[PDB]
Scaffold this motif. Structure first.
Motif, PDB file in Angstrom:
ATOM      1  N   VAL A  62     -13.499 -58.225  -0.229  1.00 58.34           N
ATOM      2  CA  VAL A  62     -14.851 -58.392  -0.848  1.00 58.34           C
ATOM      3  C   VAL A  62     -15.478 -59.940  -0.783  1.00 58.34           C
TER       4      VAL A  62
ATOM      5  N   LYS B   2      -8.255 -53.234  -4.708  1.00 55.64           N
ATOM      6  CA  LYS B   2      -9.130 -53.204  -6.039  1.00 55.64           C
ATOM      7  C   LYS B   2      -8.477 -54.410  -6.736  1.00 55.64           C
TER       8      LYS B   2
ATOM      9  N   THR C 182     -16.043 -67.374  -2.976  1.00 55.54           N
ATOM     10  CA  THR C 182     -16.462 -66.412  -1.993  1.00 55.54           C
ATOM     11  C   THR C 182     -17.251 -67.319  -0.571  1.00 55.54           C
ATOM     12  N   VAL C 183     -16.312 -67.007   0.565  1.00 59.36           N
ATOM     13  CA  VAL C 183     -16.743 -67.760   1.664  1.00 59.36           C
ATOM     14  C   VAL C 183     -17.871 -66.873   2.454  1.00 59.36           C
TER      15      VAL C 183
END
Ligand SMILES: NC[C@@H]1O[C@H](O[C@H]2[C@@H](O)[C@H](O[C@@H]3[C@@H](O)[C@H](N)C[C@H](N)[C@H]3O[C@H]3O[C@H](CO)[C@@H](O)[C@H](O)[C@H]3N)O[C@@H]2CO)[C@H](N)[C@@H](O)[C@@H]1O
Ligand SMILES: NC[C@@H]1O[C@H](O[C@H]2[C@@H](O)[C@H](O[C@@H]3[C@@H](O)[C@H](N)C[C@H](N)[C@H]3O[C@H]3O[C@H](CO)[C@@H](O)[C@H](O)[C@H]3N)O[C@@H]2CO)[C@H](N)[C@@H](O)[C@@H]1O
Ligand SMILES: NC[C@@H]1O[C@H](O[C@H]2[C@@H](O)[C@H](O[C@@H]3[C@@H](O)[C@H](N)C[C@H](N)[C@H]3O[C@H]3O[C@H](CO)[C@@H](O)[C@H](O)[C@H]3N)O[C@@H]2CO)[C@H](N)[C@@H](O)[C@@H]1O
Ligand SMILES: NC[C@@H]1O[C@H](O[C@H]2[C@@H](O)[C@H](O[C@@H]3[C@@H](O)[C@H](N)C[C@H](N)[C@H]3O[C@H]3O[C@H](CO)[C@@H](O)[C@H](O)[C@H]3N)O[C@@H]2CO)[C@H](N)[C@@H](O)[C@@H]1O
Ligand SMILES: NC[C@@H]1O[C@H](O[C@H]2[C@@H](O)[C@H](O[C@@H]3[C@@H](O)[C@H](N)C[C@H](N)[C@H]3O[C@H]3O[C@H](CO)[C@@H](O)[C@H](O)[C@H]3N)O[C@@H]2CO)[C@H](N)[C@@H](O)[C@@H]1O
Ligand SMILES: [Mg+2]
Ligand SMILES: [Mg+2]
Ligand SMILES: [Mg+2]
Ligand SMILES: [Mg+2]
Ligand SMILES: [Mg+2]
Ligand SMILES: [Mg+2]
Ligand SMILES: [Mg+2]
Ligand SMILES: [Mg+2]
Ligand SMILES: [Mg+2]
Ligand SMILES: [Mg+2]
Ligand SMILES: [Mg+2]
Ligand SMILES: [Mg+2]
Ligand SMILES: [Mg+2]
Ligand SMILES: [Mg+2]
Ligand SMILES: [Mg+2]
Ligand SMILES: [Mg+2]
Ligand SMILES: [Mg+2]
Ligand SMILES: [Mg+2]
Ligand SMILES: [Mg+2]
Ligand SMILES: [Mg+2]
Ligand SMILES: [Mg+2]
Ligand SMILES: [Mg+2]
Ligand SMILES: [Mg+2]
Ligand SMILES: [Mg+2]
Ligand SMILES: [Mg+2]
Ligand SMILES: [Mg+2]
Ligand SMILES: [Mg+2]
Ligand SMILES: [Mg+2]
Ligand SMILES: [Mg+2]
Ligand SMILES: [Mg+2]
Ligand SMILES: [Mg+2]
Ligand SMILES: [Mg+2]
Ligand SMILES: [Mg+2]
Ligand SMILES: [Mg+2]
Ligand SMILES: [Mg+2]
Ligand SMILES: [Mg+2]
Ligand SMILES: [Mg+2]
Ligand SMILES: [Mg+2]
Ligand SMILES: [Mg+2]
Ligand SMILES: [Mg+2]
Ligand SMILES: [Mg+2]
Ligand SMILES: [Mg+2]
Ligand SMILES: [Mg+2]
Ligand SMILES: [Mg+2]
Ligand SMILES: [Mg+2]
Ligand SMILES: [Mg+2]
Ligand SMILES: [Mg+2]
Ligand SMILES: [Mg+2]
Ligand SMILES: [Mg+2]
Ligand SMILES: [Mg+2]
Ligand SMILES: [Mg+2]
Ligand SMILES: [Mg+2]
Ligand SMILES: [Mg+2]
Ligand SMILES: [Mg+2]
Ligand SMILES: [Mg+2]
Ligand SMILES: [Mg+2]
Ligand SMILES: [Mg+2]
Ligand SMILES: [Mg+2]
Ligand SMILES: [Mg+2]
Ligand SMILES: [Mg+2]
Ligand SMILES: [Mg+2]
Ligand SMILES: [Mg+2]
Ligand SMILES: [Mg+2]
Ligand SMILES: [Mg+2]
Ligand SMILES: [Mg+2]
Ligand SMILES: [Mg+2]
Ligand SMILES: [Mg+2]
Ligand SMILES: [Mg+2]
Ligand SMILES: [Mg+2]
Ligand SMILES: [Mg+2]
Ligand SMILES: [Mg+2]
Ligand SMILES: [Mg+2]
Ligand SMILES: [Mg+2]
Ligand SMILES: [Mg+2]
Ligand SMILES: [Mg+2]
Ligand SMILES: [Mg+2]
Ligand SMILES: [Mg+2]
Ligand SMILES: [Mg+2]
Ligand SMILES: [Mg+2]
Ligand SMILES: [Mg+2]
Ligand SMILES: [Mg+2]
Ligand SMILES: [Mg+2]
Ligand SMILES: [Mg+2]
Ligand SMILES: [Mg+2]
Ligand SMILES: [Mg+2]
Ligand SMILES: [Mg+2]
Ligand SMILES: [Mg+2]
Ligand SMILES: [Mg+2]
Ligand SMILES: [Mg+2]
Ligand SMILES: [Mg+2]
Ligand SMILES: [Mg+2]
Ligand SMILES: [Mg+2]
Ligand SMILES: [Mg+2]
Ligand SMILES: [Mg+2]
Ligand SMILES: [Mg+2]
Ligand SMILES: [Mg+2]
Ligand SMILES: [Mg+2]
Ligand SMILES: [Mg+2]
Ligand SMILES: [Mg+2]
Ligand SMILES: [Mg+2]
Ligand SMILES: [Mg+2]
Ligand SMILES: [Mg+2]
Ligand SMILES: [Mg+2]
Ligand SMILES: [Mg+2]
Ligand SMILES: [Mg+2]
Ligand SMILES: [Mg+2]
Ligand SMILES: [Mg+2]
Ligand SMILES: [Mg+2]
Ligand SMILES: [Mg+2]
Ligand SMILES: [Mg+2]
Ligand SMILES: [Mg+2]
Ligand SMILES: [Mg+2]
Ligand SMILES: [Mg+2]
Ligand SMILES: [Mg+2]
Ligand SMILES: [Mg+2]
Ligand SMILES: [Mg+2]
Ligand SMILES: [Mg+2]
Ligand SMILES: [Mg+2]
Ligand SMILES: [Mg+2]
Ligand SMILES: [Mg+2]
Lengths: 218, 135
Positions: free
Chosen positions: A9, A115, A128-129
């Motif tokens: 994600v 998950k 987050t990248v």
RNA sequence: GUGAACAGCCUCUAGUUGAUAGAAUAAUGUAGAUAAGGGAAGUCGGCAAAAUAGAUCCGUAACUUCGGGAUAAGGAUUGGCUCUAAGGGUCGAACGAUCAACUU
RNA sequence: GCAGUCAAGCGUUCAUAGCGACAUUGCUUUUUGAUUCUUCGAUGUCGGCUCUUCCUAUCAUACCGAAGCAGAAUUCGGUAA
RNA sequence: GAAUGUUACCGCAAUAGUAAUUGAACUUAGUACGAGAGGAACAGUUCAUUCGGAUAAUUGGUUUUUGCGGCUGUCUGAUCAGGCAUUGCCGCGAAGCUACCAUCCGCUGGAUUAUGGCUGAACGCCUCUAAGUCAGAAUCCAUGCUAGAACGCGGUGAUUUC
RNA sequence: UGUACAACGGGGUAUUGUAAGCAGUAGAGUAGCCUUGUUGUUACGAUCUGCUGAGAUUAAGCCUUUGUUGUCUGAUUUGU
RNA sequence: GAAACUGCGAAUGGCUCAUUAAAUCAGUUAUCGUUUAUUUGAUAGUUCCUUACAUGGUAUAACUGUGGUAAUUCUAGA
RNA sequence: AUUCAUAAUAACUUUUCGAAUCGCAUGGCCUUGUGCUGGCGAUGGUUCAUUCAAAUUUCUGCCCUAUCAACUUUCGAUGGUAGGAUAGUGGCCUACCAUGGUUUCAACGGGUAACGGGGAAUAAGGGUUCGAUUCCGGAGAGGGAGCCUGAGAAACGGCUACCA
């Protein structure tokens, strides 16, 4: 051993050092692509689910799913297969390969989070990248923003800064498979020359038949 | 400790019990009892020995656990930005209805549309800047 | 019957079922067996034991009184079942009818 | 066969660390003789195999003393079977 | 095994027997000592050797488990199931027995020998020695281990009715 | 007279390696007989497959047992 | 304009004379007995059938980032 | 010289090619929609010819050796048929069938300190001797075999195995 954890994600990646004995053995006799459970590995990982994607044994050799087996067999490897890079055309190579089944000989275990769960790991579900590129084609940018065939793209594409000394120069892709006049012009030239060569061929074909008509009689 | 497996039968070999043969080519063979090992030494075929595991795989005996159940899924994911495009920067461009796109179009579509005719005679204009150019 | 066979093994006829008997199953014997790995290191000495073994095909050295040596040596094959081919007797172009065998 | 005593000599020097001529005192009975007591109305005659036990005049091993013992090695010896 | 009232249980220990041997590696240490060439040892660690006593989880051996299977010949009309070939033959074969061909286990003190010493006379000195005494060996006596005197013994239980 | 003993029976354990039987559009094929063929059938046929990791054996020095059936004062001898 | 993708080459060269006695080889035929990148020369109105032609679909390298091995023109997985 | 080129009918096909391709230009038309049409190039692509090649192939030609005279035919030796395999002919391989094929005009076998040739040395003529080596052809990349890619390899400054 040494864990290797991916977050699909966010895109985040962090290694983990777990030395805990009876916690490791949850991975054991489990193959690549099987889902673990989080709590057994550690307290924080509780609530999560993993999937074992590969690894390297203490001698470094890569894991390859599909062998089954715990141990290294030397395989004859080809193009379009794992653990091999065919430096020459048509080259195949005998190379050692660690099995899919997980065992204590592994230096690093490769698993991605299928998950999340109760708690959250720092530097993993923390940040987050960004993915460094964006659609370089016609119908990619199209279906990216949910557009049509008349929507063009152009100003809908991505631009990046890159300061040069003082100020900047901004850049952006070439959008290949774009619809341009020259393309329709090129199709015109072609769709035409078909017929231009068609009729003229039947002409010189009948133009010859004038000869063979009057030709002979002798 | 590690349960090994009979290279002939397919039986589970616990520590201790059984023998380990090392063939001259270095290929290793483990037997859980003097029976299996003997069969191997007799050069028998584990695919034809009824109680062996390889046999009843080759004959499709037993099984049916796979027919009994099927399991799958557990997948999904969200989206993340691009270098050069922040999330809201993308949430703004994906957003607009075609009515804004339709207005955006003709403003630029007719913009250079006039630059087409200004250019159209501009070659005719530099054709009037040099023709024959004497003296 | 099996088989080359009056072999060995089983059988019909016929004759026997006679060789003190009961209980156990120590040691040592007598007789019969089998042994991991090594393979005559045992011993006066391979004593004893073990290995070989029928048949078909193949190949078969020196030496020799040319007769031998020779089963030299060395190899391959061997069940079962379902088929094919060739090998005959008699009787009145090479047939006809007709009876029978096992062997390759 | 084994060991004493004297110590001319050996050991560069230096009798005796280690040795030792001429002589001389011995022990031993797994050598060979000498003998002919025992057994000729019969004590089975070589070697081996097997097994036990004893001897010590110690090859090893334990603890030591001596050296022409720096170390390392060796040699002489004691208590030791 | 008779007998020492009967029977039974737990014990004692006189006397006899006795048992463990030896090696290597690492380390100490390239140290001591030597100009050099060379080249130790005590302490510590891991193994080993010959011996001995057990033991059978494992591995191997053994197979009348004649337990299951397989094969030859003959016999029971066929089948099924069997008989006979001194256990017919082959494969596997539990159980038991068994193997440095398997595994485990193999004790602790006291006192001495040679020897080196203390104090110390004889002999105002000297001297391990005469009196006295310290240390000290694969040794001795024990400990530990085996048997238990059938004329060695202790504690204890119950002791007769057709 | 029992939480007893014994014989069978049952569960486990264990060895072998897939019983008899029934069935098969499995079987190299050969031969019959007929409506001479989408399956044309009938006989003989090692062997294959299915029910069948089945059947057999399993304490005789294996373990265990709420089941069944059976048994439980014969002989001799001993007293300080 | 690095990298990497696609393309093409890497079957040429250069070396050596170990094999090889009807073999190679020479001169001379054969392919009415085949294969041929390339190079040069020509060759194509026809594709759906009963719903993109203003041009369908995803997949990946380089790259970034988390890695393993004493070690290689090793490689894993995001 | 053909069952050749080429054409004809009936079908067949995990249906081959039939340009979703790039660079320079920016022209011409008219109802003016960024409509319609256009220039020389580059890369491709189907069959055909060509070229660079490849594979096999006809005829004739090799040194010493009979102290090598018979050879080939298990298990291909020679031929016939059918098939399979190849890029294709062919015992190249398989099945069936026949008993063929070579030899004193020297087979077969052995040696070669033998790669063949163009050539070299010697210089009456006729010859004798040599050629690893600048060119051509052949073979090989330690020894053997197997193979992937490819148009082309049984490749080795490619891979795989064995032996060393
Ligand atoms: N000739 C063989 C025949 O079959 C049998 O004989 C065969 C067997 O009985 C005999 O077996 C023997 C055995 O008896 C003997 N005591 C020990 C020997 N190792 C065994 O033989 C076998 O042993 C092993 C395999 O087990 C192999 O290494 C060996 O080469 C083989 N001969 O091996 C014989 C084959 O060589 C009968 N004895 C008889 O009918 C006849 O001899
Ligand atoms: N081998 C490595 C070590 O070297 C050692 O070294 C010994 C050997 O070099 C040499 O020993 C010799 C021996 O070579 C020879 N073959 C036998 C001789 N009796 C021994 O002698 C030595 O040992 C004995 C007994 O311990 C002592 O009585 C004697 O005084 C002593 N010089 O002397 C050393 C002992 O003094 C041992 N061999 C050994 O135990 C040790 O582990
Ligand atoms: N194990 C190592 C080697 O074996 C032996 O080593 C042994 C020695 O170190 C020591 O054994 C001693 C021994 O040194 C000493 N000189 C004799 C003694 N009997 C032995 O002791 C042995 O026996 C006694 C009873 O006598 C037991 O109490 C003791 O537990 C036992 N280890 O214990 C070891 C094992 O018994 C050899 N001495 C030598 O080859 C080497 O050190
Ligand atoms: N030393 C006591 C302990 O047991 C062991 O030691 C045992 C043996 O190694 C030790 O041996 C010693 C020996 O070192 C010492 N210098 C002499 C002593 N006599 C020996 O002991 C042994 O000697 C003989 C051997 O047959 C026996 O007569 C004697 O009874 C016995 N203890 O005797 C001990 C038995 O008593 C180990 N060293 C260790 O476990 C611990 O130190
Ligand atoms: N070991 C024999 C050798 O023969 C060699 O050569 C010999 C023969 O080759 C040569 O010729 C002989 C001849 O001598 C003899 N008297 C008659 C014979 N026919 C010849 O024989 C020769 O030629 C004939 C053809 O004529 C061939 O068929 C034959 O094979 C060949 N050897 O003569 C030699 C005998 O005299 C050499 N002399 C030498 O290598 C050695 O001697
Ligand atoms: Mg992939
Ligand atoms: Mg493009
Ligand atoms: Mg005319
Ligand atoms: Mg066994
Ligand atoms: Mg007969
Ligand atoms: Mg007979
Ligand atoms: Mg009698
Ligand atoms: Mg009897
Ligand atoms: Mg006996
Ligand atoms: Mg006997
Ligand atoms: Mg046997
Ligand atoms: Mg043996
Ligand atoms: Mg053997
Ligand atoms: Mg041998
Ligand atoms: Mg011998
Ligand atoms: Mg001998
Ligand atoms: Mg002798
Ligand atoms: Mg004999
Ligand atoms: Mg025997
Ligand atoms: Mg013959
Ligand atoms: Mg002759
Ligand atoms: Mg023979
Ligand atoms: Mg002979
Ligand atoms: Mg047969
Ligand atoms: Mg006939
Ligand atoms: Mg003496
Ligand atoms: Mg002197
Ligand atoms: Mg002196
Ligand atoms: Mg004498
Ligand atoms: Mg006398
Ligand atoms: Mg006398
Ligand atoms: Mg007498
Ligand atoms: Mg006498
Ligand atoms: Mg007598
Ligand atoms: Mg006597
Ligand atoms: Mg006598
Ligand atoms: Mg005598
Ligand atoms: Mg003495
Ligand atoms: Mg001594
Ligand atoms: Mg000696
Ligand atoms: Mg001196
Ligand atoms: Mg020395
Ligand atoms: Mg020495
Ligand atoms: Mg001496
Ligand atoms: Mg003794
Ligand atoms: Mg009693
Ligand atoms: Mg008691
Ligand atoms: Mg050192
Ligand atoms: Mg050194
Ligand atoms: Mg120093
Ligand atoms: Mg010095
Ligand atoms: Mg120094
Ligand atoms: Mg030490
Ligand atoms: Mg020590
Ligand atoms: Mg024992
Ligand atoms: Mg038996
Ligand atoms: Mg019956
Ligand atoms: Mg029978
Ligand atoms: Mg009978
Ligand atoms: Mg017999
Ligand atoms: Mg009989
Ligand atoms: Mg029987
Ligand atoms: Mg057995
Ligand atoms: Mg057993
Ligand atoms: Mg011990
Ligand atoms: Mg021990
Ligand atoms: Mg003890
Ligand atoms: Mg103790
Ligand atoms: Mg003490
Ligand atoms: Mg003093
Ligand atoms: Mg003293
Ligand atoms: Mg005193
Ligand atoms: Mg005094
Ligand atoms: Mg004292
Ligand atoms: Mg002792
Ligand atoms: Mg007692
Ligand atoms: Mg008593
Ligand atoms: Mg007594
Ligand atoms: Mg009394
Ligand atoms: Mg009393
Ligand atoms: Mg029961
Ligand atoms: Mg149970
Ligand atoms: Mg059945
Ligand atoms: Mg039916
Ligand atoms: Mg049917
Ligand atoms: Mg049928
Ligand atoms: Mg049929
Ligand atoms: Mg029919
Ligand atoms: Mg079955
Ligand atoms: Mg019941
Ligand atoms: Mg009374
Ligand atoms: Mg009383
Ligand atoms: Mg070349
Ligand atoms: Mg030759
Ligand atoms: Mg030519
Ligand atoms: Mg896809
Ligand atoms: Mg990938
Ligand atoms: Mg045609
Ligand atoms: Mg072109
Ligand atoms: Mg012939
Ligand atoms: Mg062959
Ligand atoms: Mg032909
Ligand atoms: Mg043909
Ligand atoms: Mg062909
Ligand atoms: Mg012939
Ligand atoms: Mg050559
Ligand atoms: Mg030449
Ligand atoms: Mg040449
Ligand atoms: Mg000349
Ligand atoms: Mg001339
Ligand atoms: Mg002349
Ligand atoms: Mg040469
Ligand atoms: Mg030459
Ligand atoms: Mg050349
Ligand atoms: Mg080389
Ligand atoms: Mg390609
Ligand atoms: Mg080549
Ligand atoms: Mg090359
Ligand atoms: Mg190669
Ligand atoms: Mg090279």
């Amino acid at each position: 051993m040494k864990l290797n954890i991916s977050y699909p994600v966010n895109g985040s990646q962090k290694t983990f050092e777990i030395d805990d004995e009876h916690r490791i053995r949850v991975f054991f006799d489990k193959r690549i692509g099987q889902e673990v459970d989080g709590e057994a590995v550690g307290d924080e990982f509780k609530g999560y689910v993993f999937k074992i994607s590969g690894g390297n044994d203490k001698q470094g050799f890569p894991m390859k799913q599909g062998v089954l087996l715990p141990t290294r067999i030397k395989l004859l490897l080809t193009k379009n297969v794992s653990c091999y890079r065919p430096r020459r055309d048509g080259e195949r190579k005998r190379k050692s390969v660690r099995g899919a089944i997980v065992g204590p000989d592994l230096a690093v275990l490769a698993l991605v989070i299928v998950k999340k769960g109760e708690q959250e790991l720092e530097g993993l579900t923390d940040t987050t990248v960004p993915k460094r590129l964006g659609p370089k084609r016609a119908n990619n940018i199209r279906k990216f923003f949910g557009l049509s065939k008349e929507d063009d793209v152009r100003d809908f594409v991505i631009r990046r800064e890159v300061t040069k000394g003082e100020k900047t120069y901004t850049k952006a892709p070439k959008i290949q498979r774009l619809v341009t006049p020259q393309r329709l012009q090129r199709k015109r030239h072609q769709r035409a020359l078909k017929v231009r060569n068609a009729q003229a061929q039947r002409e010189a074909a009948a133009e010859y038949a004038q000869l063979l008509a009057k030709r002979l009689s002798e | 400790m590690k349960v090994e497996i009979d290279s002939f039968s397919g039986a589970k070999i616990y520590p201790g019990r059984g023998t380990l043969f090392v063939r001259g080519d270095s290929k290793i063979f483990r037997f859980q009892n003097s029976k299996s090992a003997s069969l191997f030494k007799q050069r028998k075929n584990p695919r034809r020995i009824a109680w062996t595991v390889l046999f009843r795989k080759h004959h499709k005996k037993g099984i049916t656990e796979e027919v009994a159940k099927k399991r799958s899924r557990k997948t999904v994911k969200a989206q993340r930005p691009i270098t050069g495009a922040s999330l809201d920067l993308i949430k703004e461009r994906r957003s607009l209805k075609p009515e804004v796109r339709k207005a955006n179009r003709e403003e630029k579509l007719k913009a250079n549309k006039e630059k087409k005719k200004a250019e159209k005679a501009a070659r005719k204009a530099e054709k009037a800047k040099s023709a024959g150019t004497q003296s």
